[PDB]
Nucleic acid binder design. Sequence first.
DNA 1: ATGAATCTATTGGTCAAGG
DNA 2: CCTTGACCAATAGATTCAT
Lengths: 86, 87
Amino acid sequence: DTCEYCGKVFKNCSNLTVHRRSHTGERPYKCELCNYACAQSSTLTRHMKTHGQVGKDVYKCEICKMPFSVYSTLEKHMKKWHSDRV
Amino acid sequence: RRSDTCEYCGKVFKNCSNLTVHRRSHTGERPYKCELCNYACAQSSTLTRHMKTHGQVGKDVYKCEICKMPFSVYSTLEKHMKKWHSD
DNA sequence: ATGAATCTATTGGTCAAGG
DNA sequence: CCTTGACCAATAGATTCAT
Ligand SMILES: [Zn+2]
Ligand SMILES: [Zn+2]
Ligand SMILES: [Zn+2]
Ligand SMILES: [Zn+2]
Ligand SMILES: [Zn+2]
Ligand SMILES: [Zn+2]
């Protein structure tokens, strides 16, 4: 089948459905811990790795108690989302 | 009473043969084993499909340098090399 | 450094036409 | 009834940006 916007045609209709999301902006797969959403379930699994993998220490946000695997990520979360509280 | 219902989940089928393949997702049975790798599936035509990743009627075939496993897609061969041959 | 976005090849489960 | 291949979502990994 053919792409509406790009016009790029691929042998895979499943991949085209994902590609059309980039034009449409649809993000069906929503994270259960934050506002993040994406067009591919695999990419959401990758995102979920940043909320704390089992077996490693997990840092929670001081304000909203959101889990993060990496401390620098939690710092970026603070600046992006809790700047209004300073 | 026609053996159209899954004993594990209760799904009903209009084709009893579909129940036979479906049930293997509950039992883990995978009778169709690929002869060119360790792949194994529960549906005959799925193994037929997977074998297309090993080669075509003509086209070109890339074989792993170490284990001589054939591939039709080079990127797949690269993933195989990293997965099995890190030495 | 950490992670999202893009890309694509392969796979699981479904289903029913037709053999 | 069984075989078979199309269909769609899911998966896994690689590359390419963004911050
Ligand atoms: Zn497009
Ligand atoms: Zn999240
Ligand atoms: Zn927070
Ligand atoms: Zn079942
Ligand atoms: Zn194989
Ligand atoms: Zn090999």
